[PDB]
Amino acid sequence: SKPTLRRIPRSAGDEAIFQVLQEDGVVVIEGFMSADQVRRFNGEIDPHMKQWELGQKSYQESYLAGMRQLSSLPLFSKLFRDELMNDELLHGLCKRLFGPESGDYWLTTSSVLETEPGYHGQELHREHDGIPICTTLGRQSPESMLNFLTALTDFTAENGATRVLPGSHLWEDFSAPPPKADTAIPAVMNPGDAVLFTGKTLHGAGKNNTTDFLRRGFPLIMQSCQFTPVEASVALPRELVETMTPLAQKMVGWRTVSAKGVDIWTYDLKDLATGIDLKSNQVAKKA
Amino acid sequence: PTLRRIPRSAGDEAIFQVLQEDGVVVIEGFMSADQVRRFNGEIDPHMKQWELGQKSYQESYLAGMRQLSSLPLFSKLFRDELMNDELLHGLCKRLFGPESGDYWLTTSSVLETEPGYHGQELHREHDGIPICTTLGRQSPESMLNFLTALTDFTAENGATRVLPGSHLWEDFSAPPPKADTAIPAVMNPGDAVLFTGKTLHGAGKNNTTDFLRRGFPLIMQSCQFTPVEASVALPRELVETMTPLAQKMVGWRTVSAKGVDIWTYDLKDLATGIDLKSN
Ligand SMILES: O=C(O)CCC(=O)C(=O)O
Ligand SMILES: O=C(O)CCC(=O)C(=O)O
Ligand SMILES: O=C(O)CCC(=O)C(=O)O
Ligand SMILES: [Fe+2]
Ligand SMILES: [Fe+2]
Ligand SMILES: [Zn+2]
Ligand SMILES: [Zn+2]
Ligand SMILES: [Zn+2]
Ligand SMILES: [Zn+2]
């Protein structure tokens, strides 16, 4: 069935957005971030960007070679820590996706991904293939990941807009070789618009056919708390973590999370934040 | 059926075979007498009662016990001897290598049951992970429990009870039998009862008037699953005293999930990115 990529404003709310996500596996959120947020986030991000270093021999390297990438963005962005990790729409959607089979959720990875002119694109893939039990289960897998992929520049068919196959989250055989990326639908989007897809939906970065345009995307992937994050929370200094809200702290791997009633990521099997005396919403004063 | 026993010297292949067939095996002399003495010496002064009011899966099974967890924080012998043990690593490589790749520590505790302690209901350890509860028998291997006796383990004093073969039963959601139908792992100090997360087991009833029965569960887990014990509780200073391999077990290095690097810094190697020292 030759399907369509649907588009829905941020103001429609999480119920309406979640419904298209269930039916299609992917939806465009218009105005996920405002223009002002995109400007400020870009300002914070610019000076830390660089090329992906080859020689890793990993799953990451197979899909991320040729891209400019920065990850562990809690370390580099106040707007990430304070605005995005407390966003009510993000949390409403995560509660609906992950609540039934997993309970709690948290950040697995977030990156800024900039594709240069001539970048050839990715093969279509499902994001849940980073987790081996989900690869084994295929369609029968529980929901494990949710990717909020925000456009930080214009996203066009020509400049490499992320390509998606609506409905692929419901195909019978997830191990079948995926189709060519050019049969998929590019998520044409203005800055601040985000393409939202589960870890079960076939997608990939498009070919950048321009001569002079750097196409900047912002994947932010939330994950079921029972699965180990791609990005380690031990990289964050305690001092920085203590500037965030309790909820943001929990997303970045410094609080206890409940896996269907099972407390995990604990200190002495009890609450983590209590055990280590973790502070929150700290604000350093000019003194 | 019977609970089988194999000496530590027989090696990982022989031990792994009984584990596949029975889901549970006694390793004679997993730790030496001298290790048990020294480990006990280190552990003694930090023990306390489980605090109620947690409203968790942990609390449902651990109420009434004395417990200490996050044992890398309290024991040099844990950090240096146990986290580098060749037999532990040989068995984990065999259990987890096929479906998961790497593995690491999820939880380890000292569990002391007092006289009168009523025992646990029989349970499978993989029910701490929701996807494994859903899959039941069809679940991939997720956990391996090396449960070492730190005092004598007797039928009467609450030796851990196990049902050999329960890892192969068709229906994992069927209500388990009474704990007193299961076989107690009678053991000397340093012997360990080894079982997968799919095998029905539980701490026994302590029917003595005067014996404190001290067990030492050490649970390794497939790296794709979040640990029960958080690695952010460990200060960096302490982690840097351990070997690279021990560091990896306690959640401070990158682990490979069937070729997928996870627990990374900037998607690259964690230890490199944060400049992590060792030994
Ligand atoms: O059209 C359908 O319902 C799916 C059929 C199909 O692709 C299959 O099961 O092989
Ligand atoms: O950056 C994009 O457009 C897609 C990235 C992606 O799908 C991935 O790297 O897993
Ligand atoms: O300490 C014992 O004997 C068994 C403990 C146990 O099975 C558990 O707490 O999961
Ligand atoms: Fe992807
Ligand atoms: Fe248990
Ligand atoms: Zn609503
Ligand atoms: Zn079919
Ligand atoms: Zn738009
Ligand atoms: Zn051998």
Numbering used by the authors:
A (entry chain A): 7 to 293
B (entry chain B): 9 to 287
What did the study's authors say about this model?
Subsequently, EasH was crystallized in 0.01 M ZnCl2 0.1 M HEPES pH 7.0, 20% (w/v) PEG 6000 and 1 mM aKG. The iron in Aj_EasH is coordinated by H131, E133, H209, in a similar fashion to AsqJ (H134, D136, H211) and Cp_EasH (H141, D143, H217). Within this loop there is a short helical segment (residues 52–72), which we refer to as the “lid”. However, given the hydrophobic active site environment and the lack of an acidic residue that could act to protonate any leaving group (Cl or OH) at carbon 10, an alternative mechanism of direct abstraction of hydrogen at C10 by the iron–oxo species followed by rearrangement should also be considered.
EasH from Aspergillus japonicus (Aj_EasH) is a recently discovered enzyme involved in the biosynthesis of the natural product cycloclavine 4.1,2 This compound is a member of the ergot alkaloids, a fungal-derived class of natural products with a wide range of biological activities and pharmaceutical applications. Aj_EasH is a non-heme iron, α-keto-glutarate (aKG) dependent oxidase that works together with a flavoenzyme (EasA) and an NADPH-dependent oxidoreductase (EasG). In concert, these three enzymes catalyze the conversion of chanoclavine-I aldehyde 1 to cycloclavine 4. Aj_EasH catalyzes a highly unusual ring rearrangement to form the 5-3 ring system of the ergot alkaloid cycloclavine 4.
